[PDB]
Amino acid sequence: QPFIVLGQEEYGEHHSSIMHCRVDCSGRRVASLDVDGVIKVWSFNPIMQTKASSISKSPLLSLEWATKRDRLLLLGSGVGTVRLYDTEAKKNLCEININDNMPRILSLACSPNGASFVCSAAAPSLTGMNQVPGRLLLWDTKTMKQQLQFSLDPEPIAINCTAFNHNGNLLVTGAADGVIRLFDMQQHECAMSWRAHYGEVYSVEFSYDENTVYSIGEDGKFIQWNIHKSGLKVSEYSLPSDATGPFVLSGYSGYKQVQVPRGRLFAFDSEGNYMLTCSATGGVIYKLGGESCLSLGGHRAPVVTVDWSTAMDCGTCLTASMDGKIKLTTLLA
Known part of the structure; x- marks a missing residue:
């Protein structure tokens, strides 16, 4: 009962497997990036429309919408740079x-x-290939210099995923050593850290009330953690294996494509009561109350990343798959 599907549309401008697909802060634009360096910025009210396209030179590994100065997209490369992409002016x-x-x-x-x-x-x-050193850096956009190095204890390690709380006081992080580290932004040391997954942490998020954090990891678990009590599991659930991959698109050709999680593996509605996840044939939605409640379907290739944006009881769910297709499903509460 909780949601009704108003429609499902397909965005097909990408021709390679999707790495990231994120809705902007206004709920009206999507930025999506494929494994070939192609970026598309598009809208979906009331029709799908491409607002900008850009083919990247160097590999691109991460994508983040700027917060106050919207229309600005931050792109993290594989050659140690961050590119600021003006989606309005259509230029870097x-x-x-x-x-x-x-x-x-x-x-x-x-x-x-x-x-x-x-x-x-x-x-x-x-x-085991990502068990390599990593740094976590606070960069002052404004002097364009590195402001701060976060200490990663006990050793430097690649950080896969990061998320701020509402005020920007707290940053939760998930690392390739399975460890979650939570930082307050004046000090270099995490206020808190614990072993969360056996294998890499792939995605992290604060709960709506910011009393817990959610994580999803290489062991296939979704876990809720109390942030007043380091390492206190509040709950834990073993998801189907196609929620965490590795995602595989294969043919009789002797040919396969393999995607380890890189983009967000889970997304939430506005009030944090429901969670969208990946599966081989489309998004799968669960209820988070103290429980699969909707399967969105529509995909002929495994879904590898998701997003969920809410505007006033109208939610839109993005599901993105290894054939490059992005489905948009409109949900009404």
């Missing part, structure tokens, strides 16, 4: 040099107050 404003030694920009989080961003900069993947 500048290319910020983060680090040559640790060129994989695996995560970007923009401060809700607009003056800084956090970025994960990781060593090249080892030739």
